Structure formats: C-alpha cells, structure tokens
Amino acid sequence: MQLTPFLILLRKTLEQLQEKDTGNIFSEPVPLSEVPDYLDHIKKPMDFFTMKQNLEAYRYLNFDDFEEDFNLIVSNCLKYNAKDTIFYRAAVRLREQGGAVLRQARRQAEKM
Numbered sequence: 001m002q003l004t005p006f007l008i009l010l011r012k013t014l015e016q017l018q019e020k021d022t023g024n025i026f027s028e029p030v031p032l033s034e035v036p037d038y039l040d041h042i043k044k045p046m047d048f049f050t051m052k053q054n055l056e057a058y059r060y061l062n063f064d065d066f067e068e069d070f071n072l073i074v075s076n077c078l079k080y081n082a083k084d085t086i087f088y089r090a091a092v093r094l095r096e097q098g099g100a101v102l103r104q105a106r107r108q109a110e111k112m
C-alpha cells in the first residue's frame with residue numbers, strides 16, 4: 001500500500017467533508033479568545049484546518065487516524081454546546097452527512 005494514493009484519497013475526502021460544513025463553523029480552531037471556557041472540558045480541540053496540516057505533515061497513515069480527528073470535530077461540538085443551538089445541530093448534520101462520505105472513502109482505501 002502506497003502513501004501517495006492514500007494521501008490523495010484523504011485530501012478528496014477531507015474536501016468532501018468540509019463541503020458539508022456549509023457555515024464553515026469547523027474550518028478553524030474554536031476561537032479560544034471568544035470562548036474562554038472552551039478548554040475546561042474539551043481535552044483535544046479539532047478543526048478542518050488542523051486536519052489539513054496533519055494530513056500534509058504525514059500524521060495520518062491509516063483511515064482511523066483521519067476519521068478519529070473528524071469525529072473529534074463532531075463530538076467536541078456536541079459536548080460543548082446546548083442541544084437547542086445551531087452549533088449542536090450543525091455537528092449532528094455533519095455526523096449524519098459525513099457518514100456516507102467516510103464509508104465510501106474507507107472502501108477505497110481498503111482496495112489499495
């Protein structure tokens with residue numbers, strides 16, 4: 001299994017997942033200046049920019065490495081925000097619409 005096709009697949013997958021975040025609320029780290037209590041109960045912040053950096057730093061060498069960080073985006077947002085917020089519901093939607101994107105991408109990786 002070769003690194004380059006896998007990183008190509010991950011790049012395409014990341015773009016596809018990011019397309020689902022239509023408000024771009026997960027594009028960059030949660031602004032810790034704007035939400036000072038964020039780190040009280042969120043242990044590992046994650047966002048799509050950080051994911052792209054990790055990808056390009058060769059930190060993702062299997063599909064789980066990648067999916068785990070995607071799942072952190074979602075779970076951190078569910079954890080931090082009240083259910084009655086757009087932010088919470090955006091994480092739900094990202095989880096749901098991301099599901100098929102990740103499943104298809106993993107099937108591709110398994111054929112490598």
Ligand SMILES: Cn1c(=O)ccc2ccccc21
Nearest residue numbers: 025030031035077080081087
């Ligand atoms: C995703 N998210 C949160 O989960 C919480 C606060 C916040 C503030 C600005 C941008 C995104 C944010």
